[PDB]
Amino acid sequence: ELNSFQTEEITPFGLKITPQYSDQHIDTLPVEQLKELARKHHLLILRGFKSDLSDHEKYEKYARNWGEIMMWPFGAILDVRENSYMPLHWDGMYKPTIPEFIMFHCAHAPESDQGGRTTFVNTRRVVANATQQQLEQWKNISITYRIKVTHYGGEVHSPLVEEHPDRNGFVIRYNEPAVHAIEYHNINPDQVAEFQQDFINILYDKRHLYAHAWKKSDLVIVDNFSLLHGREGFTSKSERHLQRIHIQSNPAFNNQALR
Ligand SMILES: [C-]#[N+][C@@H](Cc1ccc(O)cc1)C(=O)O
Ligand SMILES: [Mn+2]
């Protein structure tokens, strides 16, 4: 009745999953149990397992065990390759569907790289830590985002607070500004600047944010319905190479914010 992997809880949220014996293969892990843990804990770091997922064919075949892949024009896999931070967002903003899971495989992460950790914000925890007056204000705010050339048109109008697709709580949908692109609704224009200051401070809080330093062959599973994610600005030059696959909910979740 024991698990077939070791688990350690991450601060402030998430699970770090590691092998029980040397050279344990990633294919040994029970995918349906992992999906349940990812929905409950929002972030899984699978570290130390043997895999050949830098092979695009093998990675795609592996991800199909998790569900329907959300395909992009370039295919199933985005190869993320290498100063400013990348703003918090959720994936699928400008697409017709929002994927439930992001899978990141680390094909390359030199110790040579300094900083630039991937950021993960548990918006369920943000909602749970808010006062009632805060949450009431946030539920009344909606935001229009304008982006780059995209395949499906490029304007997003999203409430700041949404109910989770599983109807078991509320989440935050927010795209932080980068250093009009963003336009806030239902708030006095006189208060927008300070609200933006205050809300970004709330998201970049040690109670809510986990910053991940990559190691080669990490497989990270992200609950895109519950989290926002981004990246710290890089101090040094980096050769990091991540490989990203999106997995649809069943049925796929249509993106009502796309305009
Ligand atoms: C569609 N879409 C994107 C969403 C996005 C929006 C803003 C930003 O800075 C980065 C990514 C994805 O899911 O990849
Ligand atoms: Mn992203």
Numbering used by the authors: 3 to 84, 95 to 159, 161 to 192, 201 to 280
Pull text from the paper.
Two different types of desaturations are employed by iron- and 2-oxoglutarate-dependent (Fe/2OG) enzymes to construct vinyl isonitrile and isocyanoacrylate moieties found in isonitrile-containing natural products. Iron- and 2-oxoglutarate-dependent enzymes catalyze decarboxylation-assisted desaturation and formal dehydrogenation to install vinyl isonitrile (1 and 3) and isocyanoacrylate groups, respectively. Herein, we purify and reconstitute activity of two Fe/2OG enzymes, PvcB and PIsnB, that catalyze 2 and 3 formation in the biosynthesis of paerucumarin and rhabduscin to orchestrate concise chemistries and to establish governing factors utilized for vinyl isonitrile and isocyanoacrylate moieties installation. While the active site and substrate binding of PIsnB and PvcB are highly similar, different reaction products (2 and 3) are generated by PvcB and PIsnB, respectively.
The ternary complex (PlsnB•Mn•4) was prepared for structure determination by co-crystallization approach. The diffraction data were collected to a resolution of 1.98 Å, with each asymmetric unit containing one molecule of PIsnB in the space group P212121. The final model shows that PIsnB exists as a monomer which is consistent with the oligomeric state determined by gel filtration. Analogous to other Fe/2OG enzymes, PlsnB has two four-stranded β-sheet in the center, a.k.a., jelly roll or Swiss roll fold. The metal ion is coordinated by His101, Asp103, His250, and three water molecules. The benzene ring of 4 locates in a hydrophobic pocket formed by Tyr106, Ile159, Trp102, and Met105. While the ample space of the hydrophobic pocket allows the rotation of the benzene ring, the π-π stacking of the phenyl ring of 4 and His101 may result in a preferred orientation as the observed in the crystal structure. Namely, the carboxylate is anchored by Arg265, which has a cation-π interaction with Trp74 with a distance of 3.5 Å to the indole ring. Since the carboxylate group has hydrogen bonds with Gly104 and an iron-coordinated water, such orientation enforces the isonitrile moiety to point away from the iron center. No apparent interaction can be identified within 5 Å of the isonitrile group.
